[PDB]
């Protein structure tokens, strides 16, 4: 039977209950909303424009004389005022982030003078492939696994 199931509602804000009210054929919910509902942004989009550093276009190899756009390959004044040994004799950030074959890395590491063993070289190569998303290792990555 159950003459009342869920129909007991509070009319205003008090604690006493009233039955549920009916409405045939005059509902105006769709047409009685307000302008103030438009301001309802409550706490995805692409960002539009050029960056000043402009690091998303590919780097040039032979730099033109008429080119003004930066790419981030030009260092700050910390680099051009106090260069490192790498900077002061020619090698830069690019050649430390260039993928090398295991033959190239093996000759690299032998020519430096650390004389790794075969299993130790395999462990170093596995860790260096482990830190990359795909496995393209670089000499910076080799130094990073060699530091510890």
């Amino acid at each position: 039977l159950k003459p009342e199931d869920i129909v007991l509602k509070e009319p205003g804000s008090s604690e006493k209950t009233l039955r549920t009210l009916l409405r045939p054929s005059d509902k105006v919910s769709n047409h009685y909303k307000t302008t103030s509902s438009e301001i309802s942004a409550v706490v995805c989009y692409p960002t539009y424009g050029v960056p000043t550093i402009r690091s998303d276009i590919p780097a040039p190899l032979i730099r033109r004389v008429s080119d003004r756009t930066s790419y981030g390959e030009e260092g700050n004044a910390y680099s051009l005022l106090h260069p490192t040994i790498f900077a002061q004799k020619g090698v830069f950030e690019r050649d430390f982030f260039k993928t090398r074959s295991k033959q190239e890395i093996s000759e690299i590491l032998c020519n430096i003078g650390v004389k790794l063993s075969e299993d130790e070289f395999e462990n170093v190569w596995n860790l260096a492939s482990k830190k990359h998303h795909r496995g393209e290792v670089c000499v910076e990555n080799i130094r990073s696994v060699l530091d510890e």
């Binding site: 009210l21 009916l22 509902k27 919910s29």
Partner: peptide, 18 residues
Amino acid sequence: DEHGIDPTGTYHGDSDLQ
């Protein structure tokens, strides 16, 4: 009519702007 008022006096309930 457009306030939604029953002829016997009471109010019938859809919105809160009426």
